């Protein structure tokens, strides 16, 4: 069924699945040991796969997700695709393992005493985190690809605290159109979506910048949930009216203005990822 890809294929006999790292309504990620996955050392990794009762579309979706990763290329701030098992057996997408989990949980677990999300990140750490992710997106955008699902839950943290952009499930190649237009309705990450994406079904690098602004908000609120007490239909209304989230507590006006710039009503007026990287670099340098 699935067209083999020798250069990326990896022997199942050299892979030992382990404990689950994350589960979803359309997937499953587990830890594993890959023998010789390193071309220079014939290795703890993560393996993404389908649920036991997945459909044809769930398969096509994961395959498309893998393909996007193959095309994007390597970058320090993008989770590394190591290989895949696509022949005679379930589809396994092997990716670099991030020992500190996703950004959301990473931050929430590192909030100050008494600020627990339920029953420590310095200011500079927050800027650095943001800067690393901006670099990752600048790279992705330069490949003329859009992520479409930027959010703290989709950022992984390695043992060395390196930020890695992940989950390319909604990622699209816009090299030929410079803008992806979703022709139909579907379940999308609405609270991280730009107005033109939500209402016009138009996605661009600038709609990714809007999402980056929301991600920035999540970072500075240490894992806060976008639009506090605002339900589904309630959010759609507010955005139409011009609503924008308030400034996080531990945030300078400069960084908040950067967030607000990412949420400019006019897509072309939002900063480019290159501009964000330059400005963030400047802020870090002065903070250092």
């Amino acid at each position: 069924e699935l067209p083999e890809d020798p250069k990326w294929e990896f022997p199942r006999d050299k892979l030992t699945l382990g404990k689950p790292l994350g589960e979803g309504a359309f997937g499953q990620v587990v830890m594993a040991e890959a023998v010789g996955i390193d071309k220079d050392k014939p290795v703890t990794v993560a393996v993404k796969m389908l649920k036991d009762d997945a459909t044809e579309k769930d398969l096509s979706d994961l395959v498309s997700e893998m393909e996007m990763m193959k095309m994007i290329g390597k970058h320090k701030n993008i989770i590394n695709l190591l290989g895949a098992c696509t022949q005679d057996g379930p589809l396994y997408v092997i990716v670099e393992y991030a020992s500190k989990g996703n950004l959301r949980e990473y931050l929430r677990a590192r909030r100050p005493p008494g600020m627990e999300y339920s029953y420590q990140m310095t200011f500079k750490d927050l800027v650095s985190c943001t800067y690393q992710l901006a670099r990752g997106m600048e790279y992705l955008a330069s490949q003329k690809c859009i992520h479409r699902d930027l959010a703290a839950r989709n950022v992984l943290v390695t043992e060395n605290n390196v930020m890695k952009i992940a989950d390319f499930g909604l990622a699209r190649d816009i090299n030929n159109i410079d803008y992806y237009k979703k022709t139909t309705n579907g379940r999308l990450p609405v609270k991280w979506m730009a107005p033109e994406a939500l209402f016009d079904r138009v996605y661009t690098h600038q709609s990714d910048v809007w999402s980056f602004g929301v991600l920035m908000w999540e970072i500075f609120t240490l894992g806060g949930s976008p639009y506090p007490g605002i339900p589904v239909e309630e959010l759609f209304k507010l955005l139409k009216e011009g609503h924008r989230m308030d400034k996080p507590a531990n945030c300078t006006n400069e960084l908040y203005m950067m967030m607000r710039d990412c949420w400019h009503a006019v897509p072309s007026q939002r900063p480019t990822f290159k501009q964000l990287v330059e400005d963030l670099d400047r802020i870090l340098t002065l903070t250092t």
Binding site: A151, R153, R187, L188, P189, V190, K191, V232
Partner: peptide
């Protein structure tokens, strides 16, 4: 809840 994140995807609607």
């Amino acid at each position: 809840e994140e995807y609607l």
